[PDB]
Design a protein around this nucleic acid. Structure first.
Ligand code: NA
Length: 348
DNA sequence: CGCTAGTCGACAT
DNA sequence: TCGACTAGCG
């Protein structure tokens, strides 16, 4: 995600405990729990051997949140966004290597170094995620599989008032316009919360605490959607936005060499890349739990054209979207693997 | 100072 | 995966 964002705005953070959300609703990026739980049993998962330690690992977190009187909404990743469809695969292959290498590193005796090999080959499948989903439903905990990336979905759940805070390890949530993000939370409840409103507590941030400018900064610094121009980090991007008296971001990016007083040349496809990135942060498709409909993260502004935003996710039928969201329909094969019905007993 | 890429540890015995 | 941390260079 946004490389080095947390340290950049550490002044806006605060050590908290989950009890401050007792009697309120919190959405969870379940992937972090799934991964941290999968580390404990990477060996069995790599060899294909049966294991389910990650289920219990997630469930102790769930039971903790429930013990402190909090209503958790588990959120999962869905279809891979086209913008990263290569990237993920570019990661995928590497995992395979760390499998083929890893096992061979066990043939040389080095099990200590094979640890890092098998732990860097972990692939969180939809099956494992669904096992966790069943394990959560058995405890009466609502779940929700995002149409695509879970970040946008969580951001929506928080900006809609459905949840008050979001538990995750990804800082990208901030660039999506999240209000309250709880980072680094152990199995006991000790966490680190960052609020959007308190982004002004960061001196080096300047006046770049507004959501739009902050987003521009995050994108310009380098993200999953668009690699940053070489030599551009959070600081110099922030400086560009501070020295800019211009609302139109395109002309500003074209004048980056003027704002940084450097010889920076901007490729004309990088402009389009920035536009696509911004449109992805703004209008990535998410699922509305209440209205049961595929909607963009934010309402389409008048200046944008929804017909040209396929890279931000494609629309499907709202019923199918519902079946995906409930985790009944497989992300890949589009086949029914379950039949949960919330009616016959999040979705008001 | 600031940015890149690269290593490194996570879990837990 | 994803942040943390650092050497190396503009
Ligand atoms: Na960068």
């Amino acid at each position: 995600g946004i490389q080095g964002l947390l340290q950049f705005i550490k002044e806006a953070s605060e050590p908290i405990h989950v009890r401050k959300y007792k009697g309120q609703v919190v959405a969870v990026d379940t992937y972090c729990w799934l991964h941290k739980g999968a580390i404990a049993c990477a060996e069995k998962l790599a060899k294909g051997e049966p294991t389910d330690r990650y289920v219990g690992f997630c469930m102790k977190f769930v039971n903790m949140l429930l013990s402190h009187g909090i209503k958790p909404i588990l959120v999962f990743d869905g279809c891979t966004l086209p913008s990263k469809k290569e990237v993920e695969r570019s990661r995928r292959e590497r995992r395979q290597a760390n499998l083929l290498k890893g096992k061979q590193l066990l043939r040389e005796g080095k099990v200590s170094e094979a640890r890092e090999c098998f732990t860097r080959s972990i692939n969180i499948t939809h099956a494992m995620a669904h096992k966790v989903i069943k394990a959560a439903r058995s405890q009466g905990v609502d779940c929700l599989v995002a149409p695509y990336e879970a970040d946008a979905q969580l951001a929506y759940l928080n900006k809609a008032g459905i949840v008050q805070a979001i538990i995750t390890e990804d800082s990208d949530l901030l660039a999506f316009g999240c209000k309250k993000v709880i980072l680094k939370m152990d199995q006991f409840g000790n966490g680190l919360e960052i609020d959007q409103a308190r982004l002004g507590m960061c001196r080096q941030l300047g006046d770049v605490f507004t959501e739009e400018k902050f987003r521009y900064m995050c994108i310009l610094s380098g993200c999953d959607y668009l690699s940053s121009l070489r030599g551009i980090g959070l600081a110099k991007a922030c400086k560009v936005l501070r020295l800019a008296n211009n609302p139109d971001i395109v002309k500003v990016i074209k004048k980056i060499g003027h704002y940084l007083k450097m010889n920076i040349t901007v490729p004309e496809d990088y402009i389009n890349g920035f536009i696509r990135a911004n449109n992805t942060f703004l209008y990535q498709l998410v699922f509305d739990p209440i209205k049961r409909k595929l909607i963009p993260l934010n309402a389409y502004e008048d200046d944008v054209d929804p017909e040209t935003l396929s890279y931000a996710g494609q629309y499907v039928d709202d019923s199918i979207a519902l079946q995906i969201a409930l985790g009944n329909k497989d992300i890949n094969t589009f086949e029914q693997i379950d039949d949960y019905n919330p009616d016959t007993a999040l979705y008001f």
